[PDB]
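Task: complex structure prediction.
Instruction: return structure tokens for all chains below.
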Amino acid sequence: SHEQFRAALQLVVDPGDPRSYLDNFIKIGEGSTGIVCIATVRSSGKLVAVKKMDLRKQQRRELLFNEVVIMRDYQHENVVEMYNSYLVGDELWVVMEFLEGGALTDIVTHTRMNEEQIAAVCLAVLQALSVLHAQGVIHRDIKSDSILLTHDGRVKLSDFGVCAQVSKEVPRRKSLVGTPYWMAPELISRLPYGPEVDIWSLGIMVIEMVDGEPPYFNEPPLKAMKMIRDNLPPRLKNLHKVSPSLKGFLDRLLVRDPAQRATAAELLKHPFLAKAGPPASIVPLMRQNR
Amino acid sequence: RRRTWY
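Output:
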């Protein structure tokens, strides 16, 4: 049955083994699905990322197909580009674009972002989301860990491992999926849901960018989820530290009623995003520059 | 904890 699934994956991935053209694997990152490494392309000297996912170690093995669907069909300026997929023994390997600026998480936990920088990130994420949502793709794991940066401060959405598709025939999803603190209330309440869940999650990531942490981060995951489901929308620790424009923006995101929450396409027209700076404004926040 | 659920 593991062997059954290896065979299934093989018909869908590129033939061969990327080890034949890649040198110097170094682990840089982690997740639920598996590890992320840097590798050098032997003939060019260029660096790529390689996502390795052990088939035996997945909660829902069939979600590994998400990696291939996104590669094949949904490439975009603000979305991490995937190059090739391979079955290497008991692992799926995805060779993809290396985002050398690292994850938004390292920034969020180590410095304060100004509103020009926050708005830049939000706009980049929302440009991605509005294109994905318009095609029925829901990310389902929006958080700072999923947002990666180039060295010149460009912002890209990654880690599509738990994404899903809605359509006319499948209007809503039902799976309990994501990271507790960032999960939308209707999703925690086990209601059928759609792209709106990404918008809530982004709102939690706005709080990350302001406070350095998502709400109830000091609570156990299961208690946090309960509080998200039962209580009023979570508030900023420091409301005096946001402009009324940023507060207006967040109020459109952290709406409990999914039908009243703003959509990604609506949010692109929000006055708060007018503050967005160029990619260059993000550059000083990175570890190599701080 | 920063870990995903399925």
